[PDB]
Amino acid sequence: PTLFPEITNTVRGRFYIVAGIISVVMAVASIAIFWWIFYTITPAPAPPLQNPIYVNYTQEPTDYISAESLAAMNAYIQANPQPQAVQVLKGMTTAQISAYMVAQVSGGLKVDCSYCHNIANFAQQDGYPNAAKKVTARKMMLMSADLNQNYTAKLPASVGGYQITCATCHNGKAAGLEPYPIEIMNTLPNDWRLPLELDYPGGLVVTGRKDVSNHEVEQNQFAMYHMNVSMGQGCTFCHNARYFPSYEIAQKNHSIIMLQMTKHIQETYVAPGGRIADGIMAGKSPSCWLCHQGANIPPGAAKPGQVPAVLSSTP
């Protein structure tokens, strides 16, 4: 009893039913078993870091700190209770100074205290071969305070209260800090560097200028793709792409503050009247990548209220 005798009686047509059924279940089993395998063997995307001090940077494998150094540190706190000859870091007990120095200062550099002072006497300034590193670190703390009070303060609270600290630029490396690594120079010229020469509230402006051409537009686009890499959110993160001169998105204003801040870093600290002398940071001109590292908020940026008050955006 059938109405499709060419489909249910004849072996060729009768076979077509089984063929279709088997192909449908074969394709479904294909897709289902693939996605099953993929979801069972693939690890869960790593849980987002939750450290009290930092945004997404952790210092806590603190193996880099010798035992002799942590031992002498708590001994020093036990005996010396207020700090002795602090030049920055004015409002902190030697216990808080010590906790900050291990969590943020050496936790940002991932180095022992013997990297910067003699562990017998944390207080002595020029009694050891590594005193130059301590004066460099003190000047860097001054620089951090200056960047926090003079550029992070101008950013609204909607951004957050995140403050620049050691791990913000060092990210676990004491020396050998490389802004502009080869990872972020994918389609840019490898020689290209951020043009901190210009006056930045209007330095890369190109639209309708008529006194520039595609060469300046190309320089502008190199800088803008550098910002794209430094903050992975792409090009509309601070632009309404229908009109780039527009300040619609308000991350373009934060970026103006940040451009002024990195220009200030280069002019005041990288090369104050020449980088060879009287200049910290080893002639390493800054980049947005140096601390943002592919995030809109730098991973090594400290959460609001975690840096000392002297280094804070508001002191």
Binding site: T8, R14, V18, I21
Partner: peptide, 26 residues
């Protein structure tokens, strides 16, 4: 009870398939 029900509905699919394919394959 979801695994129970998915197994239930797949076996009803299979048994339905054996029945009417048995008729077609008669």
């Amino acid at each position: 009870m979801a695994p129970f029900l998915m197994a239930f509905f797949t076996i009803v699919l299979i048994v339905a398939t054996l029945y009417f394919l048995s008729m077609i394959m008669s």
